[PDB]
Amino acid sequence: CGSQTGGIVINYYTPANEEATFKAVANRCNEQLGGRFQIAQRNLPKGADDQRLQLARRLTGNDKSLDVMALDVVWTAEFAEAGWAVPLSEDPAGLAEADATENTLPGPLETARWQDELYAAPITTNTQLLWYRADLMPAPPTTWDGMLDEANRLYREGGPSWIAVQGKQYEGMVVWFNTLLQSAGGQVLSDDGQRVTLTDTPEHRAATVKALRIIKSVATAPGADPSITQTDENTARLALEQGKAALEVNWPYVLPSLLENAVKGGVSFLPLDGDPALQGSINDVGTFSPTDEQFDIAFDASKKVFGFAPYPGVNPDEPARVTLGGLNLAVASTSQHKAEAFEAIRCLRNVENQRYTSIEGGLPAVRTSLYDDPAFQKKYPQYEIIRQQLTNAAVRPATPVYQAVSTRMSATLAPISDIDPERTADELTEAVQKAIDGKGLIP
Amino acid sequence: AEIVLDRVTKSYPRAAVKEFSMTIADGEFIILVGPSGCGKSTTLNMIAGLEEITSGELRIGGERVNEKAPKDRDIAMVFQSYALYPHMTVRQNIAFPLTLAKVPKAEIAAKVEETAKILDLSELLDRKPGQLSGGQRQRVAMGRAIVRSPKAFLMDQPLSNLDAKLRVQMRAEISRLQDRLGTTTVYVTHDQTEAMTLGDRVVVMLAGEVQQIGTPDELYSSPANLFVAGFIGSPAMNFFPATRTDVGVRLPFGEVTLTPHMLDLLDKQARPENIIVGIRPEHIEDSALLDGYARIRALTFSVRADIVESLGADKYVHFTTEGAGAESAQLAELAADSGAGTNQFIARVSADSRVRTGEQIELAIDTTKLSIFDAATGLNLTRD
Amino acid sequence: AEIVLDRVTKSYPRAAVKEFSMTIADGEFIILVGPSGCGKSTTLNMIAGLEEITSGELRIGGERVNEKAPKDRDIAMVFQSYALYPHMTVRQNIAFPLTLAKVPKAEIAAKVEETAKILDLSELLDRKPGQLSGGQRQRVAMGRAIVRSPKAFLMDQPLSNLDAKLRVQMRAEISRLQDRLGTTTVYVTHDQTEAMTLGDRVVVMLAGEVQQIGTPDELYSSPANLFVAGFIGSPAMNFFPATRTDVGVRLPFGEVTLTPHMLDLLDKQARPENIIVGIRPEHIEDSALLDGYARIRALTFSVRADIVESLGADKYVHFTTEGAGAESAQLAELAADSGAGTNQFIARVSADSRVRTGEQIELAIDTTKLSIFDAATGLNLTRD
Amino acid sequence: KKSERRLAFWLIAPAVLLMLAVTAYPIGYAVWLSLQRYNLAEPHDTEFIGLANYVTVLTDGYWWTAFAVTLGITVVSVAIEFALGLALALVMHRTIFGKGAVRTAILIPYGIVTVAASYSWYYAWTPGTGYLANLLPEGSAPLTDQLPSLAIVVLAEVWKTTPFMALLLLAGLALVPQDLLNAAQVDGAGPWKRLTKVILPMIKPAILVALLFRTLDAFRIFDNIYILTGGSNDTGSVSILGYDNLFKAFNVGLGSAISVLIFLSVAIIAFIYIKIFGAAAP
Amino acid sequence: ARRATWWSVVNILVIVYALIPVLWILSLSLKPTSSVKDGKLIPTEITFANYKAIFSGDAFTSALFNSIGIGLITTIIAVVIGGMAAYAVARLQFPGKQLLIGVALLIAMFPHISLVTPIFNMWRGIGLFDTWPGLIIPYITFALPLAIYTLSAFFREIPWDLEKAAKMDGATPAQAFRKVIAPLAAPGIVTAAILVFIFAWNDLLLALSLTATQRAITAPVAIANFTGSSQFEEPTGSIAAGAMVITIPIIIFVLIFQRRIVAGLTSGAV
Question: If you classify domain C3-230 with CATH, what class do you get?
């Protein structure tokens, strides 16, 4: 026999981690939804590859328990053009297409999109930042060649000429190459993911070679991370926290982390001893839960030996077009309650729930209404920089065959030690074309 | 009861049991004997039912029964390979025919104990046929065949898997047990000893046609062929070529003169040219202990003694006499079974004879107990 | 070779072949015969090499080889299962003992052709398989045994799988072949008929004790045990529980005074009435024509013919007898294989008599050739 | 017999129809999918592309470095596996006692689940957790290189799969009667010089099976090399190469161009082991 | 003499060689969050909470019920449809009996990934993806060779002369198949319904491709998937506990049926 399904439960699949922060929002929208639409958050594996696999193979087998998934940024094109995501204008109500764009930063709004049609309502973002040392470096650099020059200048005394960036063969290297390329003034896929413009125009080839020259120079510079082919974002964080780096670049989560990793047996050369109040607030948890003033004094003490800056461009005196790494809510096609799932989305993105997910969750807000609010601007000191980078950000190339494109674009830059900048371009063109042509093996 | 079967025949798609016709009366212990590969066993299969007959009747009693399958004949057939089920126990094995005959279990246990008392299976009724030797498994099979009390008891070469020391005791046991029960029986065998010790009316079978039917002693004395002549008897009868000299015959050695009555019986039919003679090895004595009137028909001059088997109550002297004329079809198919070489001849003489190996001994045939055969039509001429 | 061996003993952790001793001279055909399970095959596996000896010497010639290897003893062997390699073909089988010795190929081909010619292997029979019919497979095994031309030639019961109608011809072939070649041979056999047919000097083995080795004639005439009396001889010896009467012997159902000289010979040792006698089935005739001198020593008793196996010119008439008493250790271990029942005796009558199943017949014994035995050591007393 | 072959066919028909409809329609469908362009993620752009899906697998060095690994494994884990399964067979056949406590411990690595017998070597060569990992110098982690992490794979495969080659060699080794070895023994035959002229020529038809099977099995090694290192450092097999770009890149017109090339590469091995070296059904 | 001493150390080496990679996961599934290499033996403080950790929430429970169900439904049908095709060793047919035992055994050496691409693309959209009826067809097809090769090797060893004998008794041609003939083949079918289960109970790459959702997911897949988020960021105890719960049935089945299993795999070497 069997069969029950008392209430109309909507189950929205979030990443494995950041579940403790996507469950309070679920219950807060539950106690706001009404008496129906019991929201109950499930969770996918961790690691973006495993999540994509779970979602794709479970949607292929037409599962009826997958309603509101949380796609990564780069899966919108594939999950849309494939047929596994319902356009926000195809709802019983039709009120989502006008809600998911009524108040949202232009950057992330244009990262959940297919051929000028919205397929996912965005919920969070992220963007890289320069994390310099304020004392051993008199001022933040603003251009990558200036970065290398000031590094080699700092190579004289000490050993901090150790520029730290994610460089190993994985998605982070593609993100770095893509933000460099877009800063230069080019683009990988022309539009609608059909024709490559990586080398088409002599200007585009100039931008590609100007990105490859920087990628190779940061690796072949004197000193400069003896083993650069093995450092992901976490290894860059460690290379700064051990004082063995000067100008790392990394997501904005490294500002809180460092603090605690510099108060419980710190290694950042930042003493952060001060008063026993920090030690009294750091006991047995390590989470650095203060009375809202130890946080201030610790951040001010780190303001002497730890300073951030906007991402450095490549053309002299031009703002950099950094990438994005947020999430997007999206209604799966294999479902039963479609208008209900769209209600769940437009309630999970509410400005109050964004306030929560950004102040007590650690994920930046996507809606413009928060950055002009000081209560937001207390936990994110770099709110102006992150906003000015989110207002014009360089989204990764959108095309349904993106796993193949990423694998073939990271398997030809993987030897970061030796890329011959004026040559690699003629190989990246061939491999991206062989990928978007439907004939690209991955290992 | 009486198993009268006439004109029975088989046709393999070839003619293996051609024209089998007689009556196995009630009480007999018949014996089908023949070289391996004749119709001696297909005949028994057809009397049982495990094969299809072609013609004739098989009327066991008073009912033509060649149109049925065996559940309605009541004929127990003990196999050669002891086809007994290896998962039941000896008690269940001996009981199976009863428990299929729908008899209450009390009489089942009573009859099974009775039969296990008839044999020597007193205690073995609690062990599978796996932990049993040859003799006791054979006895389990025979017991399983005894219990039902059937009309016929169709034994099928059961004593072929037993040691030569046990086979004789088993033959005595089978003869006594059958004389005790008395039901009709048949028995397919392979040798002449089994066929002449436990037997009431032997039946020789060559290629399908019954060669002769008679009491075993009557197959011994007056065989009505060459096959039924040189087949039975462990020291097989010696076949000497011969050519009738119209007053006698000049056998390879001697001048036997064919005492008048057999001479005229032979002269009744002077058709062939190579009429051979058979001198049974028992009928060859020596010139040592032959004192008396028997010396005049001795025909002894001398023969070398190749091998002298001194195995007790009789010395088997082997020898050879050159020539040619022991050539027929009956003799050929009788010697294809075992090797008769060319002219190897043996003769059993008394035990008192003092003879070494490889010397010159005087063998003497007695020309009053010899049989004359025909080397073309294969049929005795003295008696039939 | 002149293969002698004494104190040859085995033991399995209890002993098997305790206290053996023989001297097989050059040319002998010594035959190890005994009941199934004695130490008659362990002695062969110890003369061969496949097992080691526990004590004593083994001097093939001299130079005790009880520590050498089977390859450097220079012996042969033909097994009971005809161990021959099917992944070869008959010629490769025959060649194996010569090729495995690293000998140039010309003389190898010559010798193997010659050795094939010694037997019936003229064209290799088939030359394709490693499997043939029974007789020629046996002959292939014997051939491979022959080719090497070794010192000793140890055949391990080769004729225990063929048919009884070919076994006799195979015995004749083995006899002639060994007499022609000239190599020492140690034949392990199972029945007394083979061992008496071929073999210059038999040996009997009961549980590992050699008994009365010499001749096949001084072993049937003067046996030195109840065992080696009731074992050899195809119709086993009748053992009657006798009784001393101070003038002769008192049979169970007969009174007779044996000759006084042999009487005192047997009475040279006082025995407390543990005496049983033995009467060969050969020395029990009928009342047919024994009239004359043997009438006084007839001892004409009377008994009903249980069965009469009239298998030719020698009617084996059985009979039973009242009472009991024929019991000893030797007789028990001899009956452990056959001769079941202590009241089922046999008597061979010349075919002259007229008897049928269940008839009161008066058998008469020539009471001058009966041997008297003890009942504790089974030792003979007439002669050993 | 006219009604006996009928029963034979009506009993043999279910298995034959099933094996046909599950092993001849899929391989007749993969040859249609492979000469095409599917991609399973843009189902509006599908076309007939001809032979441009084989000539794109054979030409790029992502297939050959996954066709040479599945040989540098399948020719070592058969040499070692045979040299060890012969020892296990001789032991299980010529042991004096036991024979019921070792012949039953051999069967444990035969029925054990390979996803539970490879997670036993993964957590054995992991530094800080496994005993076999702290018998090397400190900080080694062989599972992060290529050649060491292939040694681990061949070791796991040998351990897991030799107790079937052992039984297959025992099945043919029991058919060599002891009296035949004795007949060889009463000759000049050292215990090695009979295992090369009596045993091996007698177990030939039982080797070219136990060597063919273990040749076509180690050619499809997936789950011993998916758990240890899921094709991380270019240590991927050919089954993993055909699984990746069908269940990670969602290319079907290529996950079939490889699914039929694996079959075409196994057919050659089976044909060599059948026609030339003459194997047969046991 | 010394032969026993030299041949009793082999009988210990061959057992330690086959029990150490199991007494490793057994000692790993008992160390509580202190996996410190402490040894193939003597893991101190064996307090097992992993076993009652992986058995909470239908992540492994249902992924075990699925494997048990699929194993049973694919061994019953495999035995039923392989016995009637191995009974073609008692019968005899001219049009290709010698090549049946060749083909239906050579398809056992068939690259799974060679026919998982078209099978997957065929189950997709034809109502056969994450569900048993999609996992029991390939399992049965790949288990038929084993169930034929181990049954047509026992339908030779049983004597069919016993039917010919029972016929000469009062037995009908029907009672013979209930009594004499039935209990002889029973210990030969219970030994094929163990080999087929043991095979179809360890199959990866067929339950990893034709299976997505909660239903129709097996035990090996759900063990390879313990690197998600349920296990507390250290899935060593949990993975070892899953592996042990999985390799218990094989041990229980081998301790009992060693003789029959060897006699079936070798086909006449008992």
Answer: alpha beta
